[PDB]
């Protein structure tokens, strides 16, 4: 499912990702713009063999099972296909314990370099939230 921004961001409200760890909706959603184009199926191999799933694009070598990762953890406790799922569920709840490791969410790469430090809430303007 391709969401559409403030579709994604109600979505994730809804999930209790809003100010989630102190990280403002804006901040979510434009993570999910840049690591998915908020597509829930987009999927990404990385030159380690692990494998970046879903709408915020979660690594294999830690937080989800895809048996193709020799190694990794399941720090998700589910599948990797679970990230790809219409219903966000799954990608929030694993996002929740990946921004409590420790680094908030520079633990995304894209949000550091492409979201960080910018004018999020322009990502969640006019939507009705
Ligand atoms: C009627 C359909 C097209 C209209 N519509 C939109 O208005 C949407 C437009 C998104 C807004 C653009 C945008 O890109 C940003 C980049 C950085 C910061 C904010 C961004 N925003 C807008 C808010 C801030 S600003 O006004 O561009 O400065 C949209 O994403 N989408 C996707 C939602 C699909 C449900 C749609 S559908
Ligand atoms: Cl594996
Ligand atoms: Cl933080």
Request: with cysteine; glycine share 10%.
């Amino acid at each position: 499912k391709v969401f559409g921004r403030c579709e994604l961001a109600a979505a994730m409200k809804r999930h209790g990702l809003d100010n989630y760890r102190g990280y403002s909706l804006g901040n979510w959603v434009c993570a999910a713009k840049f690591e998915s184009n908020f597509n829930t199926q987009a999927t990404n191999r990385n030159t380690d063999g692990s494998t970046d799933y879903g709408i915020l694009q979660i690594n294999s070598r830690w937080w989800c099972n895809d048996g193709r990762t020799p190694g990794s953890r399941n720090l998700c406790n589910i599948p990797c296909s679970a990230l790809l799922s219409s219903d966000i569920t799954a990608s929030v709840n694993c996002a929740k314990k990946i921004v409590s490791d420790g680094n908030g969410m520079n633990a995304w790469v894209a949000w550091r370099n492409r979201c960080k430090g910018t004018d999020v809430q322009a990502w969640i303007r006019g939507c009705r939230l």
